[PDB]
Design a protein around this ligand. Structure first.
Ligand code: HEM
Ligand code: HEM
Ligand code: HEM
Ligand code: HEM
Lengths: 143, 140, 140, 143
């Protein structure tokens, strides 16, 4: 991922105000709700029938925290995304059998979550920077 | 295929959108042009700068089309026959671009209606926009 | 959305498929398993070897479902409600696998009916299989 | 692309029996017919209204010949697809603005054309090998 200095500054400034526990679980739960075929991987979490049950699942919240930790680690290494996500790519491609389109879907859900949380300050330039960031992250996981 | 629950959710969400539809559509178009520059090739005659009157008018047109699609959700395939003719036979737009515009519309709605954008409303709007895109990309 | 011309094309093509539907479906399933091994994860209780009786029976079931869908093309969501409930609510199948199975069915039809597989019939069958995949994936 | 020696031997033997002039043109025409939005890139080829007009286009036939020549070049360099399809990837991305999904669509159409031409000779193992080949080619163009 190649970013302009202004885009990098905006991305870092917006990520500074992100609450790691709340945004990650919210994005994972929105993924599981909007794309119900993704609960096939998370059946082990438990009750995932209603949206309120999906969004009120402690396992979903913890796994969202882990996912956002991985996203932050990727953000800290924007010039080494392929090498940063090698182990996770192996895990998702060999042991979990996750389709690469689901990575793009989760990235888009995370962008929607960021827009929901920040409102007006999620300007179209910031959204473009985050869009190419999540595109790079998804391309690294697919590799 | 839509269910009555998500149909009602989409109707309520667009009713809450109300009169800000034109500005919401213009902002969605601006977001799509900024974050997916390959979509700019479909508007070579446009002035695609920020605050452009042409983009504002086209966003108003897109919003009005979405409003009439909501009003005719059960009979969208023939309620949007003119738009299907325009986009599928004449313009020949890739459905990927429809996916991108749907995502940008969802981002705009999330940014402008925080309380209304529950996960259920998000899923309902995602499904509704997928069906509108399918009618406008299908060639019948 | 399907046009009457493509509906007639699909009807004629599957009518001439006729009694070889079970063999064609079994071969399509075998092709999907061989070329896309990730689809094998949905059948952990099955014997996925060549000439398997379980695979042959499942291919016969899939072919019968496709024949019913062809006979009820105009009311697909109401004709494939049980299969939609099975695939969307209970199995929770990724639509990418539906795309792969549709492609393998197209390859099998091309390999077994070279004469009927004209470009127009190919496009009609592609649209028909896309419509079938849409209904089974959707939950309503 | 990683293939077994038997898969490579089968792929090459079918490829020798391939009539390039007919196969490339048929694959391109079938792509343009089944996926009509792809005619936006080929509106300079003349009349592409009906399927019969698409399949009877000398420009379409010649471009299909060129595409199948590129496919053969990639087949001969299965271990260096990314380096072989660098110029073509640049041409298709920077200048033509072709979505990467259309490459996979054309690969699937080519596989269907091969099955149509060979019948029983296109066994499921041969199809699996050719699917790996065309997926590798599509990814190199996408790069
Ligand atoms: C797109 C960006 C993604 C990121 C950054 C990400 C991150 C992670 C991380 C860090 C783990 C390790 C959890 C652990 O070790 O306990 C993990 C596991 C996992 N991921 Fe992802 N993931 C992504 C996409 C997805 C998607 C889209 C799905 C499913 C649709 C998925 C399914 C899973 C599953 C099932 C696990 C194992 C959970 C468990 O064992 O409890 N991942 N992911
Ligand atoms: C997704 C929902 C969409 C809706 C509801 C929609 C609706 C409309 C409407 C109402 C018009 C104006 C019709 C007229 O002036 O007679 C239009 C024109 C147009 N649309 Fe869309 N559209 C959508 C998606 C797209 C996308 C994704 C693209 C391209 C990436 C696109 C490209 C165009 C173009 C190029 C025009 C012509 C503009 C002009 O001639 O000034 N549309 N659309
Ligand atoms: C046009 C596409 C498809 C059609 C017409 C179709 C049709 C059917 C039919 C008729 C059954 C029998 C249900 C029963 O006997 O209870 C079935 C079951 C099943 N389908 Fe599909 N199917 C399609 C696509 C897929 C795909 C792509 C997958 C997975 C990659 C899949 C996974 C399954 C599974 C796991 C079962 C359960 C069978 C068993 O447990 O014995 N289906 N489908
Ligand atoms: C595996 C997939 C593909 C391969 C191997 C391939 C190969 C080629 C080749 C060899 C050329 C000729 C370049 C030259 O003569 O300098 C070319 C050009 C071109 N390609 Fe592709 N291509 C693929 C996919 C596609 C697709 C799917 C589309 C459109 C949907 C497309 C659109 C074009 C266009 C418009 C040209 C220029 C033709 C002209 O200017 O007359 N390509 N490609």
């Amino acid at each position: 991922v190649h970013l302009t200095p202004e885009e990098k500054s905006a991305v870092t400034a917006l990520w500074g105000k992100v609450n790691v526990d709340e945004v990650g679980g919210e994005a994972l739960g929105r993924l599981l709700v909007v794309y119900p075929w993704t609960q096939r991987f998370f059946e082990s979490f438990g009750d995932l029938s209603t949206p309120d049950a999906v969004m009120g699942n402690p396992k979903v919240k913890a796994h969202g925290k882990k996912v956002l930790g991985a996203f932050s680690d990727g953000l800290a290494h924007l010039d080494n995304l392929k090498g940063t996500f090698a182990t996770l790519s192996e895990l998702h491609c060999d042991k979990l059998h996750v389709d690469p389109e689901n990575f793009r879907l989760l990235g888009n859900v995370l962008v929607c979550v960021l827009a929901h949380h920040f409102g007006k300050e999620f300007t179209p330039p910031v959204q473009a920077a985050y869009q190419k960031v999540v595109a790079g992250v998804a391309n690294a996981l697919a590799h | 295929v839509l269910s009555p629950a998500d149909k009602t959710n989409v109707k309520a969400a667009w009713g809450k959108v109300g009169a800000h539809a034109g500005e919401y559509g213009a902002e969605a178009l601006e977001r799509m042009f900024l974050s997916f520059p390959t979509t700019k090739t479909y508007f070579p005659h446009f002035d695609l700068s920020h605050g452009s009157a042409q983009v504002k008018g086209h966003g108003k047109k897109v919003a009005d089309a979405l409003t009439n699609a909501v009003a005719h959700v059960d009979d969208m395939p023939n309620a949007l026959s003119a738009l299907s003719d325009l986009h599928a036979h004449k313009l020949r737009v890739d459905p990927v671009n429809f996916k991108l515009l749907s995502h940008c519309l969802l981002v705009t709605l999330a940014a402008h209606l925080p309380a209304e954008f529950t996960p259920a409303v998000h899923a309902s709007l995602d499904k509704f926009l997928a069906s509108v895109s399918t009618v406008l990309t299908s060639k019948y």
